[PDB]
Design a protein around this ligand. Structure first.
Ligand SMILES: [Zn+2]
Ligand SMILES: [Zn+2]
Lengths: 452, 452
């Protein structure tokens, strides 16, 4: 436990303060106290003295130095969309697309997690696994079950991950074994919000109102949830414009509205803290509404490709000023890793560029931005998360490209006559061939929550 | 060393004898002697007795039992296209597409490997790394250098991997520091073929004539190589129809020919043992020629996406009766893993299916076929490689989904009321979230060449 202890981390710090930038700070000291970065000193010669210069009140006794050539600190990844309850089905989907996959795999597994013994095992596994891949902040969809959603929030608090935890709302178009009535769906949401805020009462654990998607939620439910969201200033998360059959269904179910996006708009769910997953098939008018309402988009490339949903037009969304982050979308996406997700965002953008010009491509640094600051923006936490900057939370991971078993390797003669690698090249090697085995330590709010 | 010892492997064996099939044989005994599978007995109750029943000459002393719930044998992967010399640049390519990437990264690194000290390090690393990912057979492009290509063949023999080793041929359109004259390019190819066949003299190590691609090879060189290929019955490998600027260049360079494919056809390089990498932008006429000449195609999805080359129409090629395998295409593709390659073939086929109907999608089992039997077909080795069948080589890997650090996990309650996993589902979980850490042992020609 590091509360009350002044920390200073010394070494190389890599982050992405602006889309397209990759900031690499060598031989740098980062002072941290009670989870908050207090200073960042490049070319630091004396990390302890940097702390004493920063605060007259300190003595050398009060300072803990943490010392990092092939290693660097990187911010924690932000997973803006993850159905923790679906994790038993990662890799399991066959030839199916969205609506068949929901019926065949997803409602069955979510219903099964009403068993607290199963749910506890799944939650412990997913929180620990995502942390081990460097995910420090995650927006979780759970299930319609109040009690299991409360357990997920409790275990999140215990294990030290930064989370938003949602009870899924479904009062229409679900199987009889896995559906709510309207009053229960609303009242259970009120209870979970109060329980998280007043009982769990942990700055790292937030509620989030979670209408599953428009086919699952009546107009009455959406309007009731809207009012709660407004009155209590709560995050919202839902799916939008993922699959062509889904979109046709929404049009058939809500023909009084102009579009899928207009359904959420008219029934009050589009806010500055609304996280919209997928957003593939949007019209220009829909994207314009999203921009105007200041919602954020969770780009889920692994799911989108795996379920043959489509290609998210990430550059087109960014070009309009919409904030975009990455989501794993477990289990439609098979991976718990936002690094894996970033690699697939890179690939998807090139499938689009094959037809839509090079403008559509995302660079390595842009994908790392989406994986960190982008997700922080989508969660309206970018003032406190996503980079190594004064005043922000020390949510961070240690990357060691020479960790045991690493698939990232570099020959001595490549390191600064044969061609030499830049620092940027080293980061790219981790981006493409790194995995969890290179994440050796993870900190959330300046507390070490994971050790390899 | 297992020569002279009758082996019997007992456990679960998984392979793909026909495209679209996934054959799972539990509690099965596979007898192996001097690299060759001698019997496959399902529901074996006594593996030693199975050997004694198979061969009257044996005594129990002569039999070595190898005993495998979460583990199975799978055939070795076949990497039909890998530029080992480019490995220092994996992950390093920036925003570039093919022709810029060649000039900026590839000719510089290949030239640098004229230094035997560098080359030896790279070859040891790539052979060991690919083996550790389960690749038992690989077709390597090296460089234009005779001596380093000989070293690669020598180290391949020493380390036990099954290989085809090519000296690259370039006598046109290269930098002055990295180009051959025609006579040297041809005569050095004659020497490397003789050295591999007569000096290395190892059934696991074969030569392969390697015109880099049409822009690099004069008409005179291609015709001279053709005659050698025919007279000495040698494999051929080259690139075909990867990138639109490349294709335009070929048309400008060979306007007497009808197409890129027609260049290779007219100058004699299209044979039953020709391995054609990429094959993205083929006309119907080109694919028809490939079918008629019985060439095989190396599908390289990671490279194709990363360099924004295009989408290989794998189903369309298979539909015409052309054999297709997988290639890593190190370093345009960042990964040494054919499992990673298979996952990306799965994804690419769905990008095509988004526009070309579900017919274009490849299943998990089909990708595992391309990764094993498909590559064996492309190399004209499918009678002896690619499945667990009598008379074939024991090129195999042990997959343990519970190996240390595994990202493939399964809850006890999922294993045969909550939904249960099939055997096929378990294989899919490894396909999507497995990596080298699940490959715990690798055998080539019935000799263990790798241990985790
Ligand atoms: Zn989702
Ligand atoms: Zn290649």
């Amino acid at each position: 436990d590091k509360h009350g202890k002044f920390l200073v981390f010394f070494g190389t710090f890599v982050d992405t303060p602006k889309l397209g930038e990759l900031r690499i700070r060598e031989k740098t000291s980062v002072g941290v106290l009670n989870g908050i970065i207090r200073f960042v000193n490049r070319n630091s010669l004396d990390p302890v003295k940097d702390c004493l210069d920063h605060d007259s009140s300190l003595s050398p006794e009060d300072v803990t130095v943490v010392d990092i050539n092939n290693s660097f600190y990187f911010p924690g990844f932000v997973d803006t969309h993850n159905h923790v309850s679906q994790y038993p089905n990662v890799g399991v989907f066959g030839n199916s697309t969205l609506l068949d996959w929901l019926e065949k795999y997803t409602f069955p597994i979510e219903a099964a997690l009403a068993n607290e013994n199963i749910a506890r095992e799944v939650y412990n596994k997913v929180i620990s696994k995502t942390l081990s891949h460097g995910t420090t902040t995650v927006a979780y969809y759970n299930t319609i079950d109040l009690k299991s959603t409360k357990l997920l929030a409790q275990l999140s608090s215990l294990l030290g991950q930064r989370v938003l935890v949602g009870k899924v709302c479904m009062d229409t178009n679900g199987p009889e074994y896995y559906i709510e009535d309207t009053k229960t769906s609303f009242e259970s949401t009120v209870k979970v919000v109060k329980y998280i805020r007043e009982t769990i009462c942990d700055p790292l654990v937030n509620p989030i109102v979670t209408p599953r998607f428009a086919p699952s939620c009546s107009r009455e439910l959406m309007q009731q949830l809207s009012k709660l969201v407004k009155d209590e200033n709560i995050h919202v998360q839902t799916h939008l414009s993922e699959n062509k059959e889904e979109i046709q269904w929404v049009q058939d179910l809500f023909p009084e509205c102009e579009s899928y996006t207009d359904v959420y708009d008219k029934y009050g769910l589009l806010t500055e803290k609304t996280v919209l997953a997928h957003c593939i098939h949007l019209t220009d008018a829909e994207a314009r509404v999203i921009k105007q309402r200041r919602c954020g988009i969770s780009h889920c490339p692994i799911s989108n490709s795996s379920l043959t949903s489509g290609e998210c037009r990430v550059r087109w969304l960014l070009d309009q000023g919409i904030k975009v982050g990455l989501g794993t979308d477990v289990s439609a996406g098979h991976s718990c890793s936002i690094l894996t997700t970033g690699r697939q965002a890179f690939a998807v953008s090139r499938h689009l560029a094959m037809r839509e010009t090079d403008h559509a491509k995302l660079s390595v640094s842009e994908c790392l931005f989406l994986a960190t600051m982008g997700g922080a923006q989508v969660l309206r936490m970018d003032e406190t998360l996503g980079t190594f900057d004064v005043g922000k939370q020390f949510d961070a991971q240690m990357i060691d490209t020479n960790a045991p078993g690493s698939n990232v390797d570099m020959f001595h003669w490549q390191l600064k006559n044969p061609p030499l690698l830049t620092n940027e090249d080293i980061i790219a090697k981790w981006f493409f061939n790194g995995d969890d085995r290179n994440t050796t330590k993870v900190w959330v709010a300046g507390q070490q929550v994971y050790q390899i």
